Structure formats: structure tokens, C-alpha cells
mmCIF file of C-alpha atoms in Angstrom:
data_model
loop_
_atom_site.group_PDB
_atom_site.id
_atom_site.type_symbol
_atom_site.label_atom_id
_atom_site.label_comp_id
_atom_site.label_asym_id
_atom_site.label_seq_id
_atom_site.Cartn_x
_atom_site.Cartn_y
_atom_site.Cartn_z
ATOM 1 C CA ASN A 1 39.634 -37.002 5.821
ATOM 2 C CA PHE A 2 39.035 -33.257 5.648
ATOM 3 C CA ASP A 3 40.627 -30.837 3.276
ATOM 4 C CA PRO A 4 38.535 -27.619 3.689
ATOM 5 C CA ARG A 5 38.719 -25.063 0.813
ATOM 6 C CA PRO A 6 36.515 -22.049 1.777
ATOM 7 C CA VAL A 7 35.721 -19.704 -1.013
ATOM 8 C CA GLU A 8 38.589 -17.170 -1.584
ATOM 9 C CA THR A 9 37.061 -13.747 -0.701
ATOM 10 C CA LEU A 10 40.094 -11.348 -0.927
ATOM 11 C CA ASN A 11 39.417 -9.803 -4.290
ATOM 12 C CA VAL A 12 35.562 -10.083 -4.212
ATOM 13 C CA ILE A 13 34.177 -6.570 -4.148
ATOM 14 C CA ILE A 14 30.840 -5.970 -2.494
ATOM 15 C CA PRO A 15 28.823 -3.260 -4.447
ATOM 16 C CA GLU A 16 28.670 0.125 -2.555
ATOM 17 C CA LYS A 17 24.897 0.076 -2.304
ATOM 18 C CA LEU A 18 24.988 -2.923 0.077
ATOM 19 C CA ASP A 19 26.861 -0.982 2.660
ATOM 20 C CA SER A 20 23.399 0.118 4.012
ATOM 21 C CA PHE A 21 22.473 -3.624 4.499
ATOM 22 C CA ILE A 22 25.913 -4.313 6.138
ATOM 23 C CA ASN A 23 25.633 -1.565 8.683
ATOM 24 C CA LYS A 24 21.841 -2.508 9.487
ATOM 25 C CA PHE A 25 22.710 -6.201 9.825
ATOM 26 C CA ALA A 26 25.810 -5.344 11.963
ATOM 27 C CA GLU A 27 23.682 -3.377 14.228
ATOM 28 C CA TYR A 28 21.069 -6.094 14.509
ATOM 29 C CA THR A 29 23.833 -8.803 15.333
ATOM 30 C CA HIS A 30 25.189 -6.461 18.020
ATOM 31 C CA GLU A 31 21.568 -5.878 19.358
ATOM 32 C CA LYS A 32 20.816 -9.490 19.520
ATOM 33 C CA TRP A 33 24.059 -10.249 21.349
ATOM 34 C CA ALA A 34 23.587 -7.327 23.774
ATOM 35 C CA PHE A 35 19.937 -8.367 24.412
ATOM 36 C CA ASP A 36 20.995 -11.894 25.559
ATOM 37 C CA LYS A 37 23.719 -10.373 27.803
ATOM 38 C CA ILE A 38 21.317 -7.943 29.384
ATOM 39 C CA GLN A 39 18.692 -10.651 29.908
ATOM 40 C CA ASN A 40 21.459 -12.595 31.745
ATOM 41 C CA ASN A 41 22.038 -9.430 34.082
ATOM 42 C CA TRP A 42 25.220 -8.120 32.254
ATOM 43 C CA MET A 43 26.025 -4.416 32.353
ATOM 44 C CA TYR A 44 28.400 -1.945 30.778
ATOM 45 C CA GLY A 45 31.906 -1.939 32.191
ATOM 46 C CA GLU A 46 35.166 -0.625 30.882
ATOM 47 C CA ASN A 47 36.633 -4.127 30.730
ATOM 48 C CA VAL A 48 35.195 -7.613 29.831
ATOM 49 C CA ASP A 49 34.746 -9.391 33.103
ATOM 50 C CA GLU A 50 32.904 -12.603 33.345
ATOM 51 C CA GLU A 51 32.858 -12.515 37.171
ATOM 52 C CA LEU A 52 31.187 -9.093 37.386
ATOM 53 C CA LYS A 53 29.400 -9.581 34.128
ATOM 54 C CA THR A 54 30.488 -6.372 32.622
ATOM 55 C CA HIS A 55 31.403 -5.710 28.995
ATOM 56 C CA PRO A 56 32.441 -2.421 27.306
ATOM 57 C CA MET A 57 30.423 -3.211 24.201
ATOM 58 C CA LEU A 58 27.161 -3.150 26.134
ATOM 59 C CA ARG A 59 26.174 0.206 24.590
ATOM 60 C CA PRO A 60 24.481 1.425 21.316
ATOM 61 C CA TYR A 61 26.196 0.322 18.241
ATOM 62 C CA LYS A 62 26.027 3.920 17.020
ATOM 63 C CA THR A 63 28.515 4.993 19.786
ATOM 64 C CA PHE A 64 31.183 2.520 18.529
ATOM 65 C CA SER A 65 34.453 3.382 16.854
ATOM 66 C CA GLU A 66 35.000 2.054 13.330
ATOM 67 C CA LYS A 67 37.180 -0.642 14.737
ATOM 68 C CA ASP A 68 34.446 -1.797 17.070
ATOM 69 C CA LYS A 69 31.706 -1.750 14.364
ATOM 70 C CA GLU A 70 34.085 -3.790 12.213
ATOM 71 C CA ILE A 71 33.743 -6.653 14.771
ATOM 72 C CA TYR A 72 30.289 -7.117 13.500
ATOM 73 C CA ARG A 73 30.683 -5.865 9.980
ATOM 74 C CA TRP A 74 33.583 -8.038 9.016
ATOM 75 C CA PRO A 75 31.904 -11.511 9.214
ATOM 76 C CA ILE A 76 28.954 -10.184 7.384
ATOM 77 C CA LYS A 77 31.209 -8.846 4.608
ATOM 78 C CA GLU A 78 32.897 -12.203 4.381
ATOM 79 C CA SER A 79 29.415 -13.846 4.062
ATOM 80 C CA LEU A 80 28.290 -11.593 1.365
ATOM 81 C CA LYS A 81 31.658 -11.966 -0.553
ATOM 82 C CA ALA A 82 31.093 -15.800 -0.528
ATOM 83 C CA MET A 83 27.641 -15.218 -1.957
ATOM 84 C CA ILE A 84 28.993 -12.904 -4.746
ATOM 85 C CA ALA A 85 31.938 -15.317 -5.434
ATOM 86 C CA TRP A 86 29.265 -18.042 -6.002
ATOM 87 C CA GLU A 87 27.508 -15.773 -8.580
ATOM 88 C CA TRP A 88 24.368 -15.294 -6.577
ATOM 89 C CA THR A 89 22.353 -12.212 -7.109
ATOM 90 C CA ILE A 90 21.286 -9.914 -4.399
ATOM 91 C CA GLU A 91 18.764 -7.226 -5.310
ATOM 92 C CA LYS A 92 16.506 -4.944 -3.383
ATOM 93 C CA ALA A 93 13.334 -6.106 -4.766
ATOM 94 C CA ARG A 94 10.789 -4.956 -2.268
ATOM 95 C CA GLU A 95 10.276 -2.490 0.728
ATOM 96 C CA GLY A 96 11.550 -4.091 3.869
ATOM 97 C CA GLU A 97 8.824 -5.548 6.266
ATOM 98 C CA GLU A 98 11.350 -4.186 8.877
ATOM 99 C CA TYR A 99 20.723 0.760 27.288
ATOM 100 C CA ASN A 100 17.932 -1.745 26.609
ATOM 101 C CA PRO A 101 18.295 -3.198 23.023
ATOM 102 C CA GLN A 102 15.029 -4.641 21.643
ATOM 103 C CA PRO A 103 16.143 -6.142 18.313
ATOM 104 C CA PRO A 104 13.628 -7.385 15.747
ATOM 105 C CA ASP A 105 12.416 -10.799 16.167
ATOM 106 C CA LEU A 106 13.377 -13.115 13.271
ATOM 107 C CA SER A 107 11.589 -16.049 14.534
ATOM 108 C CA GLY A 108 8.517 -15.471 12.272
ATOM 109 C CA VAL A 109 10.500 -15.238 9.001
ATOM 110 C CA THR A 110 10.165 -18.254 6.851
ATOM 111 C CA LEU A 111 12.801 -19.074 4.109
ATOM 112 C CA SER A 112 11.725 -20.900 0.900
ATOM 113 C CA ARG A 113 13.066 -24.301 0.509
ATOM 114 C CA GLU A 114 15.488 -22.839 -2.023
ATOM 115 C CA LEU A 115 16.778 -20.341 0.299
ATOM 116 C CA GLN A 116 17.158 -22.869 3.069
ATOM 117 C CA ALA A 117 19.161 -24.835 0.449
ATOM 118 C CA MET A 118 21.356 -21.798 -0.091
ATOM 119 C CA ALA A 119 21.709 -21.398 3.683
ATOM 120 C CA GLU A 120 23.222 -24.895 3.635
ATOM 121 C CA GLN A 121 25.958 -23.832 1.260
ATOM 122 C CA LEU A 122 26.751 -20.834 3.417
ATOM 123 C CA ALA A 123 26.748 -23.050 6.568
ATOM 124 C CA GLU A 124 29.196 -25.383 4.859
ATOM 125 C CA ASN A 125 31.493 -22.530 3.855
ATOM 126 C CA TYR A 126 31.494 -21.349 7.462
ATOM 127 C CA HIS A 127 32.573 -24.892 8.479
ATOM 128 C CA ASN A 128 35.305 -24.943 5.941
ATOM 129 C CA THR A 129 36.583 -21.539 6.956
ATOM 130 C CA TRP A 130 36.661 -22.526 10.571
ATOM 131 C CA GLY A 131 38.339 -25.738 9.497
ATOM 132 C CA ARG A 132 41.080 -24.301 7.339
ATOM 133 C CA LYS A 133 41.736 -21.789 10.287
ATOM 134 C CA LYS A 134 41.790 -24.652 12.862
ATOM 135 C CA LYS A 135 44.324 -26.697 10.805
ATOM 136 C CA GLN A 136 46.554 -23.549 10.632
ATOM 137 C CA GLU A 137 46.075 -22.946 14.424
ATOM 138 C CA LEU A 138 46.956 -26.611 15.355
ATOM 139 C CA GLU A 139 49.982 -26.631 13.044
ATOM 140 C CA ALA A 140 51.256 -23.347 14.463
ATOM 141 C CA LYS A 141 50.827 -24.733 18.010
ATOM 142 C CA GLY A 142 52.564 -28.074 17.486
ATOM 143 C CA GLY A 143 50.071 -30.415 15.863
ATOM 144 C CA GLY A 144 47.234 -32.555 17.324
ATOM 145 C CA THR A 145 43.724 -32.951 15.821
ATOM 146 C CA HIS A 146 40.129 -31.790 16.465
ATOM 147 C CA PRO A 147 37.117 -34.007 16.369
ATOM 148 C CA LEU A 148 35.123 -31.579 14.211
ATOM 149 C CA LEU A 149 37.729 -31.608 11.445
ATOM 150 C CA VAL A 150 35.533 -33.738 9.172
ATOM 151 C CA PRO A 151 33.446 -32.792 6.070
ATOM 152 C CA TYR A 152 30.294 -30.631 6.923
ATOM 153 C CA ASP A 153 28.027 -33.366 5.590
ATOM 154 C CA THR A 154 29.256 -35.843 8.053
ATOM 155 C CA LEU A 155 28.624 -33.580 11.153
ATOM 156 C CA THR A 156 25.656 -34.461 13.299
ATOM 157 C CA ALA A 157 22.632 -32.166 13.313
ATOM 158 C CA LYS A 158 23.775 -30.624 16.676
ATOM 159 C CA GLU A 159 27.283 -30.009 15.255
ATOM 160 C CA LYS A 160 25.792 -28.257 12.177
ATOM 161 C CA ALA A 161 23.464 -26.024 14.198
ATOM 162 C CA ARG A 162 25.748 -23.002 14.896
ATOM 163 C CA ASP A 163 26.686 -22.769 11.183
ATOM 164 C CA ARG A 164 23.069 -23.260 10.200
ATOM 165 C CA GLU A 165 21.874 -20.580 12.576
ATOM 166 C CA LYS A 166 24.386 -18.080 11.152
ATOM 167 C CA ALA A 167 23.442 -18.688 7.622
ATOM 168 C CA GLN A 168 19.720 -18.560 8.268
ATOM 169 C CA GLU A 169 19.998 -15.382 10.195
ATOM 170 C CA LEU A 170 21.769 -13.569 7.275
ATOM 171 C CA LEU A 171 19.221 -14.806 4.780
ATOM 172 C CA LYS A 172 16.183 -13.998 7.061
ATOM 173 C CA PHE A 173 17.521 -10.511 7.654
ATOM 174 C CA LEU A 174 18.128 -9.910 3.839
ATOM 175 C CA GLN A 175 14.544 -11.141 3.267
ATOM 176 C CA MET A 176 13.057 -8.960 5.963
ATOM 177 C CA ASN A 177 14.751 -5.966 4.365
ATOM 178 C CA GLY A 178 13.329 -6.680 0.962
ATOM 179 C CA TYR A 179 16.153 -8.453 -0.698
ATOM 180 C CA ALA A 180 15.702 -11.211 -3.102
ATOM 181 C CA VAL A 181 18.560 -13.634 -3.243
ATOM 182 C CA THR A 182 18.826 -15.919 -6.290
ATOM 183 C CA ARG A 183 21.131 -18.269 -8.295
#
């Protein structure tokens, strides 16, 4: 049984100051995506094409329209709104330690046990968001089920990994930019 209730973000307001973090982290997430594509021999094209390995978003984040930037900014805003809804504090406590994209490597950033615990809550909320969306999709398309429509805690480690990776990346990037996140 699975009744996912992701945190309701619609009326959560992110403080204006965090817009600098949103834009830097959006840029990073695009750069990481682009890096992997370019490593796999992808190139700029006017259309997405898996045969030719072209993609129109293989160019600098700074050249994007607002709409295209929002592709990366929206999920980050949704993450921060969850954190704010949970009454976590996010404060710039320290100076940050921070077409051929070469994004920062996050593999050397270590989260405290307590930040890892916070990453688990984020990960579960990602799963709940996907899950509630998936139930609506299924019903709109005529029913059926999906094997991952189970509570987060019941997922295997492999099934948890994508959500865990997402949550860690956000917290690591916050830490690298000098933010303390507490509850």
C-alpha cells in the first residue's frame, strides 16, 4: 500500500537572496548533464536526436532563454521549497570553497551524518512526488499499476539510488557554497 503525500510547495516562498544559489546550482546541473553527453560524443544540434546524438541544449547555460533556464531552476526551487516547508534553516555561514563544460567535482564533498539524514527526507519526498504524479498519470491513461508504487522505505538500495543521488547533490552543492543547513 502506497498513499504518497509530497510536501505542498505552492505557497512556499523562497527568500530572494537564494536566487544566486538557484542560478549557480541550475548552471551546475546543466554543466554536469552536458559534460556526460559530450563525453559520449554528443554535439549541439537544432533538434534532439538520439541517432545523430545532437541536442539544442548543448551550449552554455548563460545563452539560454528564461524558459530553458527554468528547466533546471524549477526542480531546484521545488527542493528548496520542501526544505523551507519543513522549517529547515538555510544560511550562508561561510565563504564557498567553490563548448567544453568542466563542472566542479562534488565527489570529494563529505556530508555529516545529520546532513545525510536530511538527504534521506529529501529523497523520500522526491519518491512521493514521483509517486503521486505516477498515480495521476496511470488514472488519466486508464489504470494499471507500477512496481515502484511502494513506500520509499521499502524500496531496494538500487531503487533508492536516483533519489538519494539527487538529494546528496543539492546538499553537497549547498555545503560547497558555504551554506549551513540545519533543523
